[PDB]
Amino acid sequence: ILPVSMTKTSVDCTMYICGDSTECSNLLLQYGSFCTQLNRALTGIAVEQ
Amino acid sequence: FNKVTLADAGFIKQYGDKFNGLTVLPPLLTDEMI
Amino acid sequence: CALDPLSETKCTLKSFTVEKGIYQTSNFRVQPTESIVRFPNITNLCPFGEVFNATRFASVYAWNRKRISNCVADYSVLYNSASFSTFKCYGVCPTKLNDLCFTNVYADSFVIRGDEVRQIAPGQTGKIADYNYKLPDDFTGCVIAWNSNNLDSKGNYNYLYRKPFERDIYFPLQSYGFQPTNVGYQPYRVVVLSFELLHAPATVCGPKKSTNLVKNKCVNFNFNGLTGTGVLTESNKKFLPFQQFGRDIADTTDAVRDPQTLEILDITPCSFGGVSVITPGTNTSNQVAVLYQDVNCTEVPVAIHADQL
Amino acid sequence: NDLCFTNVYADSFVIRGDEVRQIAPGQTGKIADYNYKLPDDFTGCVIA
Amino acid sequence: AYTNSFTRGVYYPDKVFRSSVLHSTQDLFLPFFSNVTWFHAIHDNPVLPFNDGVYFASTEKSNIIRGWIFGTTLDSKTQSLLIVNNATNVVIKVCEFQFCNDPFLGVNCTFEYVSFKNLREFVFKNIDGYFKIYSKHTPINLVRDLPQGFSALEPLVDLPIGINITRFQTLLALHAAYYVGYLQPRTFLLKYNENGTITDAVD
Amino acid sequence: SNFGAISSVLNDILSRLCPPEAEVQIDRLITGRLQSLQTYVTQQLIRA
């Protein structure tokens, strides 16, 4: 028996961190491209499965 | 296929249809294509 | 970026060329939403007209505690009042008190020397705070203090001084020399409001009018001071009769009971970042297709709020 | 003295001394609503 | 007498719906597999300490147990919580009562409120001066003992009374059996089913 | 989790506080939730 794939998770990091708050979403932009590179990493993991 | 099972939150609580930005995407090849 | 799915994609990628593929897109779409407000049906007004106007407040060695409950609470009248020299708040900011709503509120009230008002803050150290009126270091509440040199000075040695909210009675008991000619040695009256924010039914709630209830649209809601932005949908969750709110695996609020009509509403966030855009290269075409991730096609206009797009 | 602005504005007026407590960026109260509110991100000095 | 309480005395920790989830909570709970002091109401009602809080249960066919008293001195020096069901509704007071030498119900004040074959279970705790009451009722078929099984007690009422309680007593109808256990600061894992109902726990 | 904020619920902070302090409490939740996601994505990359 061999593992071949795992579950293709996707996390919308703005909705995880800020939960539909505009006030938080404007503060989360001050952290720059941390959120887009988390989505980029999980997309690469998911496409790789 | 019967010997591997889910009991998780989730995973099973999402996959059985959670809304905190997390989602599970389907595989490209369906189990029927595999 | 709000124009169309290709523009949302170009803004997701920070790029004017888009290469051939399927792109999971960050939101950017315009998000107009209407406010909704709900509170229990009650018509009493809270007794601040007693608490802030009593003939004498207590001595600070044995301060008096009033429970406020089952009433509409006009904190805006207190905050507009010229009577108060300082009006601190901790864990709440006073402007929000009229939107916010509590299970009970406790007023503690007494007289102190004016220099001692600085000691009435969370977890403070000093010859009143550490000895006979300690506030919690996690105190949520407002401290309202003013010179009473016209009311309480004569001096008036009938005013006396000696854990969080502890009361205790040879003794270290001492008196204040309150005379009209005293600036820090004046008497100051004070009231401290402590807010009971527990998840039991609220009974002390600001004078803000409850709206009609809007289902199946993205709304900026408030139920008993519990706010959020979300779609409200009536739901089949079997709440037990004591339960007022419902929570997800995340312990985030997943449902609420309306305080005026005892129906259960699920809450769903409005965002929908579950969009992917299928494109050939922009060198090939500006034509795209959109995948709305795990939604039924009849539900797409409702999932994305297409009438607001 | 090491610093060089594009414009400077002096806001000049009289209030009761007790109300000088209200003239700060994050402050609230009747001065800080009905007649003189600072920006919550204000850069400058308050002299009284 | 004593008996070992099994998985009994668990209650809903908060006024929140949760469903299809395992939830860890820390609160004053009666420990699992723990000794509860057992008394007959037929053939007495002594004073007990309150400790951090009390679990109380009665096994019944008769409604002989009808109320409770809580306080410190129980002698009119200070407020004391009195709870009685008058066989029509619950009545509650916190007055400075001067109680009888051997209190029973015949066959200053501040706060006041008005609303074997069966088992009635109750929990009393006094956190931050809120006297919280939880409740459950079930059929049974055993005169001796509490049942070996699980059911969660749900909120009866909450009273903002502020008494510094340290002692307790029950009240009987006079011209059945009951059990007393003490709550302790414990972590429990609670099993909320699809109907949002606590169906099991781990101490 | 609180991550040192007054509440783990982002809507408590927004319903109780005004912007100068709400931004300080939200930045603790942003920092901890962003670290919670970075820890998950890092361990999913190693697991992948």
Curated annotation (Swiss-Prot), chain D:
Residues 16-18 are annotated as: Integrin-binding motif. Binds to host ACE2. RBD also interacts with the N-linked glycan on 'Asn-90' of ACE2. Cleavage of S generates a polybasic C-terminal sequence on S1 that binds to host Neuropilin-1 (NRP1) and Neuropilin-2 (NRP2) receptors. Interacts with host integrin alpha-5/beta-1 (ITGA5:ITGB1) and with ACE2 in complex with integrin alpha-5/beta-1 (ITGA5:ITGB1). May interact via cytoplasmic c-terminus with M protein. May interact (via N-terminus) with host bilirubin and biliverdin, thereby preventing antibody binding to the SARS-CoV-2 spike NTD via an allosteric mechanism. Attaches the virion to the cell membrane by interacting with host receptor, initiating the infection. The major receptor is host ACE2. When S2/S2' has been cleaved, binding to the receptor triggers direct fusion at the cell membrane. When S2/S2' has not been cleaved, binding to the receptor results in internalization of the virus by endocytosis using host TFRC and GRM2 and leading to fusion of the virion membrane with the host endosomal membrane. Alternatively, may use NRP1/NRP2 and integrin as entry receptors. This is Spike protein S1. It comes from Severe acute respiratory syndrome coronavirus 2. The chain holds residues 388 to 435 of 1273 of the full protein.
UniProtKB/Swiss-Prot annotation, chain E:
Glycans are attached at residues 35, 86, 108, 164, 195. Changing residue 106 to D: In strain: Kappa/B.1.617.1, Omicron/BA.2, Omicron/BA.2.12.1, Omicron/BA.2.75, Omicron/BA.4, Omicron/BA.5, Omicron/BQ.1.1, Omicron/XBB.1.5, Omicron/EG.5.1. The chain holds residues 27 to 290 of 1273 of the full protein. Attaches the virion to the cell membrane by interacting with host receptor, initiating the infection. The major receptor is host ACE2. When S2/S2' has been cleaved, binding to the receptor triggers direct fusion at the cell membrane. When S2/S2' has not been cleaved, binding to the receptor results in internalization of the virus by endocytosis using host TFRC and GRM2 and leading to fusion of the virion membrane with the host endosomal membrane. Alternatively, may use NRP1/NRP2 and integrin as entry receptors. Residues 1-203 form the BetaCoV S1-NTD domain. It comes from Severe acute respiratory syndrome coronavirus 2 (2019-nCoV). This is Spike protein S1. Disulfide bonds join 95-109. It comes from the Viruses. Binds to host ACE2. RBD also interacts with the N-linked glycan on 'Asn-90' of ACE2. Cleavage of S generates a polybasic C-terminal sequence on S1 that binds to host Neuropilin-1 (NRP1) and Neuropilin-2 (NRP2) receptors. Interacts with host integrin alpha-5/beta-1 (ITGA5:ITGB1) and with ACE2 in complex with integrin alpha-5/beta-1 (ITGA5:ITGB1). May interact via cytoplasmic c-terminus with M protein. May interact (via N-terminus) with host bilirubin and biliverdin, thereby preventing antibody binding to the SARS-CoV-2 spike NTD via an allosteric mechanism.
From Swiss-Prot, chain F:
Changing residue 15 to A: In strain: Alpha/B.1.1.7. Changing residue 14 to F: In strain: Omicron/BA.1. It comes from the Viruses. Subunit of the fusion protein that is processed upon entry into the host cell. Mediates fusion of the virion and cellular membranes by functioning as a class I viral fusion protein. Contains a viral fusion peptide that is unmasked after S2 cleavage. This cleavage can occur at the cell membrane by host TMPRSS2 or during endocytosis by host CSTL. In either case, this triggers an extensive and irreversible conformational change that leads to fusion of the viral envelope with the cellular cytoplasmic membrane, releasing viral genomic RNA into the host cell cytoplasm. This is Spike protein S2'. It comes from Severe acute respiratory syndrome coronavirus 2. The lineage of its organism: Viruses, Riboviria, Orthornavirae, Pisuviricota, Pisoniviricetes.
